[PDB]
Design an enzyme around this catalytic site. Sequence first.
Site, short mmCIF file in Angstrom:
data_model
loop_
_atom_site.label_atom_id
_atom_site.label_comp_id
_atom_site.label_asym_id
_atom_site.label_seq_id
_atom_site.Cartn_x
_atom_site.Cartn_y
_atom_site.Cartn_z
N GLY A 84 39.31 48.58 51.37
CA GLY A 84 40.38 49.03 50.51
C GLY A 84 41.32 47.95 50.03
O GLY A 84 41.26 46.80 50.47
N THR A 85 42.19 48.34 49.10
CA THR A 85 43.22 47.48 48.50
C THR A 85 43.98 46.71 49.57
O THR A 85 44.03 47.11 50.73
CB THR A 85 44.23 48.33 47.70
N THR A 86 44.58 45.59 49.20
CA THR A 86 45.33 44.83 50.17
C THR A 86 46.81 45.24 50.13
O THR A 86 47.33 45.63 49.08
CB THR A 86 45.12 43.28 49.97
#
Lengths: 244, 228
Positions: free
Chosen positions: A30-32
């Site tokens: 997932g996104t950071t």
Amino acid sequence: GTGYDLSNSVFSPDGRNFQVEYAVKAVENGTTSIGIKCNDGVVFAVEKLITSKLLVPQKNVKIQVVDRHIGCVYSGLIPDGRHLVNRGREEAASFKKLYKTPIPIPAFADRLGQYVQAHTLYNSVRPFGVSTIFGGVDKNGAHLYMLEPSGSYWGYKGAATGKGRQSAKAELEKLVDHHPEGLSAREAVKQAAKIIYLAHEDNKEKDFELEISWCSLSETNGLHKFVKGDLLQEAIDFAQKEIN
Amino acid sequence: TQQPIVTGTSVISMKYDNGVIIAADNLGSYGSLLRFNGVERLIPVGDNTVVGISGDISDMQHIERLLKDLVTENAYDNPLADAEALEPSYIFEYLATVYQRRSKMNPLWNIIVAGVQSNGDQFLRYVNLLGVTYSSPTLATGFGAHMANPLLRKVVDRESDIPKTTVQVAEEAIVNAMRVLYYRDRSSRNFSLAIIDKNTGLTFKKNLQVENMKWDFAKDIKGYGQKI
């Protein structure tokens, strides 16, 4: 034999819980997002991949607040993250109702801790598909935390998870060394915007949208608030500048 | 079913051309004993609403906690919490809903919700332990219903008279009423008053006191029918 990875509460021969580990995969994918603890508060920031031009800008918010002083951001399966916050929110209301005082950050951490750990005890539930960074200011200081699907969590000076957790962590470690006296709320807000920009390279393919929030005993009176307008642009630029 | 123990008396209010005013003394009676004197019975919610509560103080304190939560909860996942935020009508409809208690035979207990809203409109509505609700240019609870309404209705008899009424005229009527209430009511000389103006915003006054009282004529009254 094998198959020790098909049921959630099962122990593999080497003492691990593979289902929890597979949950981590969903997180890393997932996104950071990150968290920076400063001398009187904490800052949260996350990457928001612009899948298309159809995404109304600034709308699809991700950072969440718990009560009035807790800020939560997470990487992984977003729905699972909301679920964990809903709980935390109740967990907080319940605490306040009985003790009057709003829930201490550490106390809050264990609440989420215990609840998440709970989802690794039975095979009738799935572990959480998110790593969460949360924190705030309380009776004695600011506290930054990160929680793993395993339910494990610790106090941090800086923390990051998601796609570019390494870039981030790298940056964070620099900060920790180059600021043994303590960063400032104003400072951290920019620094954060930068780290998100840097860590965005491990996904440089898609365009993103920045999102920051903070809780500073002086800058926000100990309340969690989102960084908007001017102060946001100022930080967006501070990054845009050092990205080159 | 219960019975009120520590209680608060009247809560008077009315609406003028630009907003609404609401006041309540700072007493917490315990039977006939005027036990507590630092009781704030006006709960401001946000900056467009003020809730005046009378009745069982313990239940009032509960309703307080309810409101603070309504605030907190409304902020959740709401990026327009301070913009397009709690309205007085929302706060009221909620509290009124919380009928339910009377419908579960355990009332609560105790309210006048005063405020402005976003579209400038003035909000003034009443709700009690029975879950009964109503609105009027002026509203008072308990004793004030008997002595304050009569004065305030002189103001604003009908609708409208609202625009024709200024904040000074209004606040004056309120402050006079508070004196009256002190003369005939479980009331205190010290009270709080709040004005919610669609321009000046919320003005919350604390520690006011009844002044300009006529007591002098008392010296001329002796006996109960006796000349000295």
